[PDB]
Amino acid sequence: SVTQQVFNFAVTKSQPFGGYVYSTNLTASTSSAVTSTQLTPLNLSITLGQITLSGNSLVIPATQIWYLTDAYVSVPDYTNITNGAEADGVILIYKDGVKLMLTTPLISSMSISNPARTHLAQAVKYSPQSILTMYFNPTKPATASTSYPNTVYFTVVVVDFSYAQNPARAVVSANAVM
Amino acid sequence: SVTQQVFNFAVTKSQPFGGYVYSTNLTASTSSAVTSTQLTPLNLSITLGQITLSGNSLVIPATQIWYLTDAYVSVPDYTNITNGAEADGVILIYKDGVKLMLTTPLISSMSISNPARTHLAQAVKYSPQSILTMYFNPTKPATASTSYPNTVYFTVVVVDFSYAQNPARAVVSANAVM
Amino acid sequence: SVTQQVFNFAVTKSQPFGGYVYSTNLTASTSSAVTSTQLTPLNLSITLGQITLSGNSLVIPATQIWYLTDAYVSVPDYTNITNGAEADGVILIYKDGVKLMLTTPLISSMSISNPARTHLAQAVKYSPQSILTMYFNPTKPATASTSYPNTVYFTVVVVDFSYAQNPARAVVSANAVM
Amino acid sequence: SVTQQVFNFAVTKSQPFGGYVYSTNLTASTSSAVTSTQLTPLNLSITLGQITLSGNSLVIPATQIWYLTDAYVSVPDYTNITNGAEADGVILIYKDGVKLMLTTPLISSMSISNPARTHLAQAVKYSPQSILTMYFNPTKPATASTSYPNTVYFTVVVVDFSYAQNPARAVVSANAVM
Amino acid sequence: SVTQQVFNFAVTKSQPFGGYVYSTNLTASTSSAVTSTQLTPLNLSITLGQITLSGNSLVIPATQIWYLTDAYVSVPDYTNITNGAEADGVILIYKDGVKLMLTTPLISSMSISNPARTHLAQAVKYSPQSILTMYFNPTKPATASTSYPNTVYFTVVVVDFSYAQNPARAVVSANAVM
Amino acid sequence: SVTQQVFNFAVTKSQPFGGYVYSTNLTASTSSAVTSTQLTPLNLSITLGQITLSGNSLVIPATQIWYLTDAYVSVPDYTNITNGAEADGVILIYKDGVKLMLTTPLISSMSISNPARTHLAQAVKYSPQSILTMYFNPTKPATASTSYPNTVYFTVVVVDFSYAQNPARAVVSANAVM
Amino acid sequence: YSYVHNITTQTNIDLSSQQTIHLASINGKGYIIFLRFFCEGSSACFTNVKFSVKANGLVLYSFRYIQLLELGQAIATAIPSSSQGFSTLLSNYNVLISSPIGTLPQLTLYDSYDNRYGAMLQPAFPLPFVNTLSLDVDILPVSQSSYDPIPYSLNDNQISTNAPTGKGNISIEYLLYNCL
Secondary structure, three states: OOHHHHHHHHHHHOOOOOOEEEEEEEEEEEOOOOOOOOEOEEEEEEOOOOOEEOOOOEEOOOOEEEEEEEEEEOHHHHHHHHOOOOOEEEEEEEEOOOEEEEEOOOOOOOEOOOOOOOOOOOOEEEOOOOEEEEEEEEEOOOOOOOOOOOOEEEEEEEEEOOOOOOHHHHHHHHHHHO | OOHHHHHHHHHHHOOOOOOEEEEEEEEEEOOOOOOOOOEOOEOOEEOOOOOEEOOOOEEOOOOEEEEEEEEEEOHHHHHHHOOOOOOOOEEEEEEOOOEEEEEEOOOOOOEOOOOOOOOOOOOEEEOOOOEEEEEEEOOOOOOOOOOOOOOEEEEEEEEEOOOOOOOOOOHHHHOOOO | OOHHHHHHHHHHHOOOOOOOOEEEEEEEEEOOOOOOOOEOEEEEEEOOOOOEEEEOOEEOOOOEEEEEEEEEEOHHHHHHHHOOOOOOEEEEEOOOOOOOOEEEOOOOOOEOOOOOOOOOOOOEEEOOOOEEOEEEEEOOOOOOOOOOOOOEEEEEEEEEOOOOOOOHHHHHHOOOOO | OOHHHHHHHHHHHOOOOOOEEEEEEEEEEEOOOOOOOOEOOEEEEOOOOOOOEEOOOEEOOOOOEEEEEEEEEOHHHHHHHHOOOOOEEEEEEEEOOOEEEEEOOOOOOOEOOOOOOOOOOOOEEEOOOOEEEEEEEEEOOOOOOOOOOEEEEEEEEEEEOOOOOOHHHHHHHHHHHO | OOHHHHHHHHHHHHOOOOOOOEEEOEEEEEOOOOOOOOEOEEEEEEOOOOOEEOOOOEEOOOOEEEEEEEEEEOHHHHHHHOOOOOOOOEEEEEEOOOEEEEEOOOOOOOEOOOOOOOOOOOOEEEOOOOEEEEEEEOOOOOOOOOOOOOOEEEEEEEEEOOOOOOHHHHHHHHHHHO | OOHHHHHHHHHHHOOOOOOEEEEEOOEEEEOOOOOOOOEOEEOOEEOOOOOEEOOOOEEOOOOEEEEEEEEEEOHHHHHHHOOOOOOEEEEEEEEOOOEEEEEEOOHHHHEOOOOOOOOOOOOEEEOOOOEEEEEEEEEOOOOOOOOOOOOEEEEEEEEEOOOOOOOOOOOOOHHHHO | OEEEEEEEEEEEEEOOOOEEEEEEEEEOOEEEEEEEEEEEEOOOHHHHEEEEEEEOOEEEEEEOHHHHHHOOOOOOOOOOOOOOHHHHOOOOOOEEEOOOOOOOOEEEEEEOOOOEEEEEEOOOOOEEEOOEEEEEEEEOOOOOOOOOOOOOOOOOOOOOOOOOOOEEEEEEEEEEEEOO
């Protein structure tokens, strides 16, 4: 329960300033059958009001605070990796294009069917509007015929401030303490 | 795994008012083989008196406080998701039609044959009258022929107050403390 | 570990008043190939002195407190459920014919051949003498020929006060302390 | 961890009187392919020194206290049960041959490979001289040819007092305390 | 699961007297395909000195304090247990050729491929020179032709004291507190 | 959840002095098909600026504190070990050349395709500069033709101080409190 | 204050005799700013579905699509006298679009080919609502042949015996400006 400690942290800090907490699922998918070198995955989140932030280098909205808490890989992807139909490798997590903050331990290892699956290292806070980008550095690339693209899911706990009283000073006073 | 903590939270807090806690089964099912875009599953709840609330957008009755806690997917669906006979994806949980409250983590990982079955992060409260709506956001859609619709069951803990001395004047005072 | 919590709770609460706490396997068998509509299952409990309390609508003996704690389904039933030889559905659990206390989530998913079997919400208590009736509400009924009856095993913790020095009032007196 | 709390309680309470707490394995074996009705399984306990107290109705010797803590069944035993190669049913656990205390919940269900394995209900304490005996009541018996005997494993905690001093005074003081 | 707590316990306690704490791998292996009765496994421990302590009845060197923590059984062994190509059973653990302190839970059930891989109860201490010896008590012995010997790997925490001021004086003060 | 406990411990003590805590991957590889005896694997870690510290016996940079917390073995390595195409064995972890810190338990048994793989014993810390070197002491060497070199992945928590006020002697102040 | 923009749906409705469906409900004070009503499915969207918008239980709007066409809140037409009236209009033309609205609703979209129907509503000043705002859909099957579009009361439940039927799905988009 590393998501359940972040979820308990946001609903106690952002509640006196007026604040809405929920969780969503971010999908980073490296396109078109990586076989040679470092590629870049296309992040695609579904936030509250039917909106779809697609494309590389997702920019956070100006009233939301994100928390990248966990990551996993679906079981039909883990079947394809160990059969050599799609690539293995690590995934680098950047903030503002400058800080390298984490490196996921070998995405073939974090399949959701194994109870002894290694998780993400720590829950990463992402401030209001600021670049979230990811890179995919493959090792043992895809070899078999009829290869498939990669897909690695992430769990984002999203704090939202769009229903406060005065949201201009509600965000910037809650972002400092939390 | 969160149902047993929110159940004893209901039996302790509702009993000074008269509190009749029980559990019922909710069924969400997108019709007709989702393959491209965001679909709408048909809710279906079964309360006490053979009352089958159907269609989208269920309304909580005026004497009850619901709790949407857990979910699971049967094995004859999970053998189809890995075979590409029905779409994977997540389920968004809305409250009052605009506020998104949760996201179910990747319904193929909620199968009943996964030894690490993933549950929900926290159970969501639903007060008297408040519209519950859900949507299905498909990642890795169905590609095989003779596809099948999706079915993901849920679990609702209902806190009834109709058998106290007053059905209306008491539930609105335990809604403030729970 | 949900059975062992309510067993250990009973043997420290009913111990200063004298209480013979033990476990018992309950059987609920809907008879003769349920195929269209709501049925009624034949209960069967085997207490200490080899007497088998049978028939629909068990009346609980006047010096005992029952705790219905778990539910599971054997493996040869689960082969017959998924092959359409016997009907799926849920089970409703009453008390004095009016008070609905649980709904078992889809008895095919409570099977023991799966490593992530779903559980009940809470261990349901039952006072001295009070009627216990159940019902079977079939969804997706038995389809293939040469059908079979349904059978869902339960597990009941029986606190017993009959061998102390005190009547059927001291049983209900130590019932409401719990 | 239900063996560990019993183990730490026995280590703490029997230490000032002088006491030797260790853990062993007990084998209940219903011989010769049970097919019809209620049988009697051969107990075999392995104490220190390859003693192998075998045969029905083991008497606890006058210096030891035994704690029947947990019960399970092996994985080829589970495979032979679900193929109908050996019989299913319950196991009744008696004290002094008259007092029933526990009934194992359907020994097919307690296979050691499932994480959703149902445990024993409570750790049964056996005092000095006292007679442990068990019975096997079969439901849906063995059907296939080349049937096999049944074997169910128990985990016993033995608290010995023979090496301390005059062991009778230590046994009566410790059995008064723990 | 217990190997991380006694390691941290050994570091904090052997520090005021000065000492290594590290880990090694101990191999117990019953020779030549046990089919009848009580057999003796051949221990083989290798410490940092590249010195192999083989044969039965290993002697702890005069400057070390060992701790036997966990055990596991590899997959080509567990493939052969479930086919009957080698024996199941437990392993008894003695000290000083006299005391018996543990009995490991059913060496098939601690295979590395069981998702509920069971661990040991508590770590076994070993002072300066003492005789660690094991005995393998087979239940369900090997029945198939071309059988294989057993192999159960252990994990030992070794607390060396060789770098203190006087190592023979340091251990007899640290054996009291640890 | 062992790497997330030392990660949270690192960010608590690096917060008053400044510190850039992040997780990387160390890859130890024995070159060219070990077949007889103890070999030496060439480490390869990746710090921030695409800096590949290669060669045997990596030297820790002068203002960083490392933490070796995890190890795993990929699936094409585990299917090559059990096919006898590369050697099994253990891996020794040395600090300054002098101290032995750990021993990994039998690298084939910490593969990732097994749902209950074994773990290490502790996270070994590493101060400003020390010579981290490893050794692969094989058992059951490579027997089949067309053998492959080994590859065993690790996971390092790196605590950089280079973006604090003075990364020369503030790193030696936080080294003592950790 | 805050904007509230939403789309409510019912995705499979029997257009049979005498049903009442409750689409959405909004609590709190606010101002109605923009509304859209849409139906899809069979041609029985056009005649059998009555939309209703209430505020604090008091009815603001209640209409149908054939009421909006036949009472002149649609595209501006002019039919020759040698005809049969509106029966010659719906039998000859497939798609009818009309943009400008004002406070009263207008039949903006008639699509008999693709079978989509729709109306819009933009108040010329923000229409307040105090306690609740509720949206209802009443399925009352009435044939196209008579219907008597001139209204005589608010709660006129008029039906016929040979009205068309089918299945369809009904959506309502709204944009409000609520209080906090």
